[model samples]
Target: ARVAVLISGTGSNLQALIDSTREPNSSAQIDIVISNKAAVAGLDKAERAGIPTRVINHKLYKNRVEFDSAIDLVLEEFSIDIVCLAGFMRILSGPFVQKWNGKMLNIHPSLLPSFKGSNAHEQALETGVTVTGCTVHFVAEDVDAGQIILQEAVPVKRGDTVATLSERVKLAEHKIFPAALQLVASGTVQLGENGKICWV
Candidate 1:
């Protein structure tokens, strides 16, 4: 699969995917890395890994749809097979979401259907949940409501602050995101006709 990773932050998840695909006999190839902002560390990481990089610069567009349309052009140019949203902060337009459908994936810090959106760690801590972790899922228009692919739970520490919980959750994110990507890229997983995941 020719993968294009989208990023907005440190890109640790992106780095994990990159590292995994570098090993012998990996099916997925990160063809390009796209970032909404210039000068982000994620772009630097991709450049260091010798992957092609592009900047969509969402700010320059008139709206979210326009921004996504701009990205669509780039994806077409690269002939990308899969899109991975690694800490990509933008909320994609409905049209964009429909177009990508099963072809896109995203990783969230907390086991979704629980603490979603930003500050997931904070929400987890506030709720006093005993277990929290990361989730890798198909990206849907409804934010984190996509069908589950994989998740690993981390115990909530007694003195856990948002930072500490986030740090630990990120570890799990790094681990599972690559696994999820491999499963998809290798055709070992796919969406069924009923719009649910079918593990092949």
Candidate 2:
């Protein structure tokens, strides 16, 4: 099946997606990588892999809905069957998320239902939690409120900066993004009702 990855910033996770699925019969062949930035670093990675790439920038949009429509247009153009949000910073509306409810997924930087949303690393460090992880889950109307699919945790160090702590999380993200995608690709994990994700 085909899949598309969405990125906003670094696209480090996009790189991880590329590295993990390079082999044939792979769980998911990342068909296209889309960016909301005109001169995105992620686009460069996509180009290098010979995968199709496009940008919407959002800056040209009058509002978020317009931006989302732009995204939908590209996804349709490429015939993307599945979508994964890799560091896509924007919060999507319920209606928009439902458009791909069961078929879309996102990588969050926290254990979820715990330290959800942005600055998760900061929240973990502030809360004095020693261990924090990343999660790959379904995207629902609520931000970080989706059903959990899988997670990978890492220990927070004594003096970890946001940058340093995130690096650790990215490692776990790279590890799990593929694992989750593989489960979907194998058809072993069935996309069930209520947007529940299931696998053997």
Candidate 3:
């Protein structure tokens, strides 16, 4: 399957997917990388991997609707089969989300339904939780509140800060994002009724 990765930052997860695709019998190939911000490290990483890249800067658009529409057009042009959001900062409008609902995936820091949105690591630490982790899930209209595909827990140490915890969670993300994509792309798992997961 052809995949498109959306990124806003370093794109470590994107790098993971790139490596995954290079392996024999991998389920998907990332054909294009798109960024809403210019000159991000992820874009360079994608280019280095010889994947087609594009920058549709959200700032250039009048509204989220326009920005998302442009993205939709680009995805269509490239014949993208799956969409992966790896640290993409922009909030996609509901219509855009619905257009690709079951075919999209996202990796979130911190176990979902606990710490959603930004600052997930900070929220885990502030709440004094001993266990924090990462989740790879199907993208839904409600931010991180999507059907979880995979999750791995990391224990919080006594001296853990937001940065340290985030680093650990990111490692988990790097592992699961590629794994989740494989499962979905290969038809080993799928989005079921009412946004639930159906394992084949």
Model 3 residue 43 lDDT?
94
RMSD of 3: 0.8
Candidate 2: tens digits of C-alpha lDDT, residues 1-200: 68999998888888988888886768788888888776778888889889888887778888888888888888888888888999898877566788988778899999998888788988999998889999998888888887788899899999997999999989999999888887776776756764576666
Candidate 1 achieves a global lDDT of 0.92
Among residues 3 or more apart in sequence or in different chains, the pairs in candidate 3 whose N, CA or C atoms overlap within 3 Å are: none
| Candidate 3: tens digits of C-alpha lDDT, residues 108-184 | 89888998888898889989999999999988999998789999999999999988888888888889989999999
Across 1-200, the per-residue lDDT of candidate 1 in tens digits comes to 99999999898999999999997878799998999988999999999999999998887899999999999889989899999999999899999989999989999988889998988888999899999999999988898998889999999999999878888888899889999999999999987778999898
Which is better, 2 or 3, measured by lDDT? 3
Prediction 3 TM-score vs. true:
0.98
For model 2 the local lDDT of residue 150 reads 84
* Worst lDDT 10-window in candidate 2: 190-199
> Positional deviation of 77 in candidate 2, in angstroms?
1.0
- Model 1 root-mean-square deviation: 0.8
